[PDB]
Amino acid sequence: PSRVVYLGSIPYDQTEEQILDLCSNVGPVINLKMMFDPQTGRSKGYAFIEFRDLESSASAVRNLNGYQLGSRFLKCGYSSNSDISGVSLEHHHH
């Protein structure tokens, strides 16, 4: 486990604020990394979310995985990273 989770299969128009609001139902979020196209504002379909504690990140993996958001079923797993700084490395191997 990690306090950081990966969240994937996110509908592209969902904003950082909407993903933050979603994740808040799990627990407090201390960091959130997403990517958006500078011309369209559309995201790339994923986020890394760092929670305040491991109970919360466990709950994220259990309860955000399979969560229906719009027409999509989200995927959620633990990040291989213990902190938010290295997550870009991880994602560019997928």
JSON list of C-alpha atoms in Angstrom, two decimals, residues 6-49:
[
{"chain": "A", "resi": 6, "resn": "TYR", "atom": "CA", "xyz": [-3.88, 5.85, -9.29]},
{"chain": "A", "resi": 7, "resn": "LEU", "atom": "CA", "xyz": [-7.35, 6.58, -10.67]},
{"chain": "A", "resi": 8, "resn": "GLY", "atom": "CA", "xyz": [-8.01, 5.71, -14.32]},
{"chain": "A", "resi": 9, "resn": "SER", "atom": "CA", "xyz": [-10.68, 5.50, -16.99]},
{"chain": "A", "resi": 10, "resn": "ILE", "atom": "CA", "xyz": [-11.86, 8.97, -15.91]},
{"chain": "A", "resi": 11, "resn": "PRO", "atom": "CA", "xyz": [-14.16, 10.73, -18.38]},
{"chain": "A", "resi": 12, "resn": "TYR", "atom": "CA", "xyz": [-11.98, 13.38, -20.08]},
{"chain": "A", "resi": 13, "resn": "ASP", "atom": "CA", "xyz": [-14.09, 16.45, -19.31]},
{"chain": "A", "resi": 14, "resn": "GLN", "atom": "CA", "xyz": [-14.10, 15.80, -15.55]},
{"chain": "A", "resi": 15, "resn": "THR", "atom": "CA", "xyz": [-12.21, 18.67, -13.93]},
{"chain": "A", "resi": 16, "resn": "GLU", "atom": "CA", "xyz": [-9.64, 18.54, -11.09]},
{"chain": "A", "resi": 17, "resn": "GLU", "atom": "CA", "xyz": [-12.31, 20.05, -8.84]},
{"chain": "A", "resi": 18, "resn": "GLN", "atom": "CA", "xyz": [-14.78, 17.25, -9.72]},
{"chain": "A", "resi": 19, "resn": "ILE", "atom": "CA", "xyz": [-12.18, 14.54, -9.05]},
{"chain": "A", "resi": 20, "resn": "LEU", "atom": "CA", "xyz": [-11.24, 16.27, -5.78]},
{"chain": "A", "resi": 21, "resn": "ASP", "atom": "CA", "xyz": [-14.93, 16.33, -4.79]},
{"chain": "A", "resi": 22, "resn": "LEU", "atom": "CA", "xyz": [-15.25, 12.62, -5.65]},
{"chain": "A", "resi": 23, "resn": "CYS", "atom": "CA", "xyz": [-12.14, 11.68, -3.67]},
{"chain": "A", "resi": 24, "resn": "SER", "atom": "CA", "xyz": [-13.30, 13.80, -0.68]},
{"chain": "A", "resi": 25, "resn": "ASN", "atom": "CA", "xyz": [-16.02, 11.21, -0.10]},
{"chain": "A", "resi": 26, "resn": "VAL", "atom": "CA", "xyz": [-13.15, 8.83, 0.73]},
{"chain": "A", "resi": 27, "resn": "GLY", "atom": "CA", "xyz": [-11.00, 11.15, 2.86]},
{"chain": "A", "resi": 28, "resn": "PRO", "atom": "CA", "xyz": [-8.87, 14.35, 2.91]},
{"chain": "A", "resi": 29, "resn": "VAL", "atom": "CA", "xyz": [-6.67, 14.83, -0.15]},
{"chain": "A", "resi": 30, "resn": "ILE", "atom": "CA", "xyz": [-3.23, 16.42, 0.30]},
{"chain": "A", "resi": 31, "resn": "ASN", "atom": "CA", "xyz": [-2.02, 16.22, -3.33]},
{"chain": "A", "resi": 32, "resn": "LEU", "atom": "CA", "xyz": [-3.65, 15.60, -6.70]},
{"chain": "A", "resi": 33, "resn": "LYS", "atom": "CA", "xyz": [-1.86, 15.24, -10.05]},
{"chain": "A", "resi": 34, "resn": "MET", "atom": "CA", "xyz": [-3.75, 15.29, -13.37]},
{"chain": "A", "resi": 35, "resn": "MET", "atom": "CA", "xyz": [-2.88, 16.36, -16.92]},
{"chain": "A", "resi": 36, "resn": "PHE", "atom": "CA", "xyz": [-4.93, 18.54, -19.23]},
{"chain": "A", "resi": 37, "resn": "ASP", "atom": "CA", "xyz": [-4.46, 19.61, -22.85]},
{"chain": "A", "resi": 38, "resn": "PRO", "atom": "CA", "xyz": [-3.56, 23.34, -22.80]},
{"chain": "A", "resi": 39, "resn": "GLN", "atom": "CA", "xyz": [-5.87, 24.13, -25.77]},
{"chain": "A", "resi": 40, "resn": "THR", "atom": "CA", "xyz": [-8.97, 22.10, -24.85]},
{"chain": "A", "resi": 41, "resn": "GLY", "atom": "CA", "xyz": [-8.87, 21.79, -21.04]},
{"chain": "A", "resi": 42, "resn": "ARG", "atom": "CA", "xyz": [-9.71, 18.10, -21.48]},
{"chain": "A", "resi": 43, "resn": "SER", "atom": "CA", "xyz": [-7.90, 15.72, -19.14]},
{"chain": "A", "resi": 44, "resn": "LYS", "atom": "CA", "xyz": [-5.96, 12.60, -20.13]},
{"chain": "A", "resi": 45, "resn": "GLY", "atom": "CA", "xyz": [-8.25, 10.17, -18.23]},
{"chain": "A", "resi": 46, "resn": "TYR", "atom": "CA", "xyz": [-6.32, 9.61, -15.01]},
{"chain": "A", "resi": 47, "resn": "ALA", "atom": "CA", "xyz": [-5.21, 11.13, -11.73]},
{"chain": "A", "resi": 48, "resn": "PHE", "atom": "CA", "xyz": [-2.83, 10.35, -8.90]},
{"chain": "A", "resi": 49, "resn": "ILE", "atom": "CA", "xyz": [-4.33, 11.23, -5.54]}
]
